[model samples]
Target: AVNPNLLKHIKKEWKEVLDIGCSSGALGAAIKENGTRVSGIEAFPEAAEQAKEKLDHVVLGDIETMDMPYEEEQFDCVIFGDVLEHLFDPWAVIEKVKPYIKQNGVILASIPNVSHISVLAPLLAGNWTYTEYGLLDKTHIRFFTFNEMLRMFLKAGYSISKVDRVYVDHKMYEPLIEELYGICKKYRLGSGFMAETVVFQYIIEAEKSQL
Candidate 1:
């Protein structure tokens, strides 16, 4: 969570929190101090089982097609962490998740920017390296630019409370990424930043439709 403001909206004192596509259940753990009734769904069995350590409950299966066995409006907040980009139909999931939120409930989501400075700057310089985790995560089904990501959430029957960037933690990236970011703005790269790859982890908080 790059922006501290994001977690502030969690309504943490309220109970019944749902974390979708929670990889390690780390999000659930992070909010433990807030003392919410947090549970999570994970696609990977290994991670799902591991998540149980951090969360009160864990569901293991495919988030894309699984039945999503949670109750309607069951949570004060819903969380989707860096899992949106891995879905083939990101918007569809958002729509489905909507019915399950409580009134005045919030959706907290984080997705890869795919074209963040970390991912784009080097690709343009002729180094299209796919990272183990980043814009080039081979397992990712789709990528989103910043605006496109925002539009998807907005169109999915939710109003964005806030939008911001988070790190995918590419500690091994080029040392000059900060310097290169300036150059990138002036001229397009060989591959171009606007084209391929997801860079930043786009963190979004959207409130469910009031209507």
Candidate 2:
């Protein structure tokens, strides 16, 4: 499914947009339809072919090895929707992509949460299972909590302007959690720590300054 949070960041003012790991370029197509110039990198041939119909440019290859085809500061936005954790070195990838973004450009991302209750509860039982998707996806090589997520973009030369968590209260401990939830509400102890136990992912929007 297309993340609603990511879609909100696409703007008419952003004339140029790039999507990394764009599967079928659905997001790019949506941006193109709204008058933005869209380009993307898709590793699959068929997906790239499908994306070509929608995007201005679709480069089919491994993003790590493929040279960026755009000039410096050419794109107004770069989106990574649930794309980073699958990379071998997502930090380096972000750094390399930074130059292509305009001085005032935004970097939007949807990064999965490794600290969610689903993962945490399983660990409590000493169980870790790989799945087709979600936090323990077999293809994912890296993981991060919310703080590391922030640091990733900051270290890549961007500053966070906004952040929202994707919450998933799995009801794993609902029996007693219901009481704890009541107590937390009674005392108004809500904070980032409280969020960490439930959030499944983070939707981040960051900006880059002039080079």
Candidate 3:
């Protein structure tokens, strides 16, 4: 499903977009529907084939190592929707793609928060389980707290313009939060004083600097 939060950051004036790790072109299709030209890169052949039918163009190759056919500074927007964590080195990938974006081009990403109570609650109970999806998705190779995510964008030479926390209901994890609080108290760690504990994901909008 296309995240509306991520979609909201895309400017109508931006004519070209690149969807990184664009599985099956769902998000790209949606963006194209908005009258923007959307291209995508997918590692899987199956998904790439499906995406080619929807997106303006689809490249079937690993984002980390593939030689992108697009020219430098060709895109007005670059999107990494729920894709960074699955990468071996999201930092390098971001750096590699930076040159493809036009000056002042925006990067919209929806990243799962590893610090969410859903992951923390299980850790407190000595369970570091990996599930099919959610915070501990089995495919996620790299994890990031909210601060780490911000640092990544900064390190990649992008200036952050906005950050929107996609909050899950805190009430659903009340008991877990209470237990996590006790654990934090015992370990001298901070409690859920920050909203990150309840944030399921973070939708970030970062722009490539002119310099």
Candidate 4:
């Protein structure tokens, strides 16, 4: 079984880190150490209190309307793991946070793919339902396809570095693989459909372009 909480995409030796929507700083703790200084922003007071124990500092407030208390260009990395879609305007949030990142700093995010087969097949049946979590999470206000996700980073003044898809497990998506295979062959080097259907979520990292 895969450790779902482990973020394999973070490869850099980040010295100063900012974790947005950090619940208890568990994600930051599991990913980085090396005497890194981690600051967190969380909306819940109780969660922020817990995060303060693990994180270097924890700000308890909603980022959408709250002022950023930190200095400019202060962080080596800023992570928005599973947090962007919850915002009313993720693009604005990305643009707002960009100033906090140092030149060559990384902005890493994990966003759900609204076009996943699990979401599409249900919509095809006119059966859009909400569960506790997943692509159709109750709180997700913004949605984007693969290409749009890449464009968001580029337009936000970052140079795109990597995009990795976290595919659904084999047991839940056997037919998906075969379907993508057929689509791939039919399109013949022109298949953009596979990403829309097979990708459950995207893990992306981009570097700040300006000095």
TM-score of each: 0.75, 0.89, 0.90, 0.87
Question: Candidate 1: misplaced stretches above 4 Å?
Answer: 1-9, 167-199
Worst 10 residues of 4 by lDDT: 1-10
| Candidate 3: worst-modelled 10 consecutive residues by lDDT | 188-197
lDDT of 2 by residue, 149-202 (tens): 988888887889888877765676655445656766888865454557678888
By TM-score: ranked, best first: 3, 2, 4, 1
Off by over 4 Å in 3: 175-193
Query: In candidate 2, what residue range of length 10 has the lowest lDDT sum?
Result: 172-181
User: Residue 16: error of model 2 in Å?
Assistant: 0.5
Model 4 CA lDDT for position 68: 96
Give residue 20's error in model 1 in angstroms: 1.6
lDDT string, candidate 1, 43-144, tens digits: 778888889898988889776788878888888888876677778898888888788889888888777775676656666787867667656787787878
lDDT winner: 3
Per-residue lDDT for 74 in model 2?
Answer: 92
Q: Give lDDT tens digits, candidate 3, residues 27-96.
A: 8888887799999999889999999999999999999889989989999988999999999999999889
lDDT of each: 0.73, 0.83, 0.86, 0.80
C-alpha RMSD in Å of predicted model 1 compared with the true structure: 5.2
In the range 26-112, model 4's lDDT, one tens digit per residue, is: 876765566778889999888888888888888999988989989899998898888888999888888999889988888988888
